[PDB]
Amino acid sequence: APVLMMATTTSTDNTGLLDDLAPQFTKDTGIELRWTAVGTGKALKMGENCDVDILLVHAPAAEKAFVDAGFGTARTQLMYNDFVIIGPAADPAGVKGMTVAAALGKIAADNAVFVSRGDNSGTHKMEKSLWKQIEGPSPEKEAWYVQTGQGMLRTINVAAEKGGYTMTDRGTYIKYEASMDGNPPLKILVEGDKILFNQYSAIPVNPAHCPKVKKDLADKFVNWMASPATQKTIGDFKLMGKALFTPNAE
Ligand SMILES: [Cl-]
Ligand SMILES: [Cl-]
Ligand code: NA
Questions:
Q1: Residue 47 C-alpha to ligand 2 middle, in angstroms?
Q2: Which range of residues forms the domain containing residue 189?
Q3: Is the distance from CB of 168 to CB of 123 less than 8 angstroms?
Q4: What is the rounded distance in angstroms from the CA atom of residue 206 to the CA atom of residue 198?
Q5: Could you tell me if 96 and 115 lie in one domain?
Q6: What is the CATH classification number for the domain harbouring 28?
Q7: Do 100 and 51 share a structural domain?
Q8: How far is the CA of 136 from the centre of ligand 3 (A)?
Q9: What total number of domains does the chain contain?
Q10: Which ranges of the chain does DSSP label H, i.e. alpha helix?
Q11: Is there a single domain that holds both residue 109 and residue 147?
Q12: Which of 98, 130, 220, 231 could form a disulfide with 247 if both were Cys (CB 3.0 to 4.6 A apart)?
């Protein structure tokens, strides 16, 4: 009764995608998928310690280092979710429909309130990376730049209280927008930019590093997830009725 063991991330688990996919994978392939959801570093460490057969993660540089170490065979890209910048509907900096770089530069130029996670999360790291691409200086010392040291929902709530802008994953936005009966005060103002993509890949753990790894089960999962039918299933997945993942297997 074959069992495939996966390490993935807390954010992944929170979307609920695997709760939908896993019974379909078992129907189609006979293989039971078990997963543990941890931070990215810890997931990678689980693969390095031979704890699991496959990773499903969303951190391209660390993933490339994992493969280069010989701990994984290769990255297969599968889908992405995305990040958005939100702010008051009135949009006091006037950034709606700008690119990320123009919006962040404009917020910086207008000294508009911008709220960071400030907690070294994956989301925080993504937000910091965005600033690295404006022409102007790092915002970290500016009084308009707020660092909560809190999670995503809390940080959204501070941006709402302050009339501020913030970067969020779309999933948490969708849940927050539903908590305000579809009419929160903060709206999605910047979205679609390629830099805001959160690319997922699967990586089989390498049998040269972990000789008892269930490579053939891992490869079956990759095959399944990259198939047109499961791609379509990922693209049709909804969170509270709204789209979250774009399939993009090669
Ligand atoms: Cl623009
Ligand atoms: Cl959070
Ligand atoms: Na300034």
A1: 24
A2: 84-195
A3: yes
A4: 24
A5: yes
A6: 3.40.190.10
A7: no
A8: 10
A9: 2
A10: 10-15, 17-29, 40-48, 60-68, 100-110, 122-131, 152-162, 170-179, 215-226, 228-236
A11: yes
A12: 231
